[PDB]
DNA sequence: TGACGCCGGCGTCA
DNA sequence: TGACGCCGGCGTCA
């Protein structure tokens, strides 16, 4: 559907829900916040997190990530 | 200073956190929602709540209370 | 009132009922339970609970907290 | 080499890593632990857990979770 | 980072 | 409605 939840996004990136949480928080990434505080990432947001993954897999430190 | 939390609003109204959550959920009182999903009421959002309290104590059914 | 409900004890400790109930179980404070299953705290029990909160905020580990 | 970590098992079951760790503590399920304390589920572990997910949905109580 | 326990909202029994 | 457990976000420790 439109968006997925942290769990779905983490299983697809092969990372942990915790990691997803740290990335969004630390990187100030824009995602929709659910009425209960749950992260809601759209197909477009994933593209962002997908990038964060690739960049990280190149020695790039999370603080030094460009978006 | 300008935003009360459920635990606070409840202690004042002399009720449980669950009671407050139940009045907000059932009667749809638009109250500022926290980025985490926590209710955050205004000094005046407290009145509307202290109102329902007095009404209820007068035999007023929740589904019947008016805002 | 020889007893106070979880919500009274909580409003005095500036915490939710959840937090109070959590502490109770974690340290096993024989605390009474009325015929309805609700918790009935005695002004004596509130004393112990207030203590815990103090020690807790002082870094004292759940497992380390002292009680009578 | 079939040793999955909490994250991989949670993905296969379609639940959070937290939900998994509970099912484990709650039912004393056998899960190996690293020097670091990280879980490492085998082929069986994932099956037992996958079965629990079933019963849980079928309304079966925790304390009553058949355990092949 | 993983494990873990706290926190506040929510559905559910009683 | 209180007690209880689950949820997912978040802080903290190792």
Swiss-Prot record, chains A, B:
Residues 6-26 bind DNA. It is found in: Cytoplasm. Required for the formation of axial filaments and for anchoring the origin regions at the cell poles in sporulating cells, thus ensuring proper chromosome segregation in the prespore. Binds in a dispersed manner throughout the chromosome but preferentially to sites clustered in the origin portion of the chromosome, causing condensation of the chromosome and its remodeling into an elongated, anchored structure. Belongs to the RacA family. This is Chromosome-anchoring protein RacA. It comes from Bacillus subtilis (strain 168).
Swiss-Prot record, chains C, D:
Transmembrane segments: none annotated. It is found in: Cytoplasm. Residues 6-26 bind DNA. Required for the formation of axial filaments and for anchoring the origin regions at the cell poles in sporulating cells, thus ensuring proper chromosome segregation in the prespore. Binds in a dispersed manner throughout the chromosome but preferentially to sites clustered in the origin portion of the chromosome, causing condensation of the chromosome and its remodeling into an elongated, anchored structure. Belongs to the RacA family. This is Chromosome-anchoring protein RacA. It comes from Bacillus subtilis (strain 168). The gene is racA. The chain holds residues 1 to 65 of 184 of the full protein.
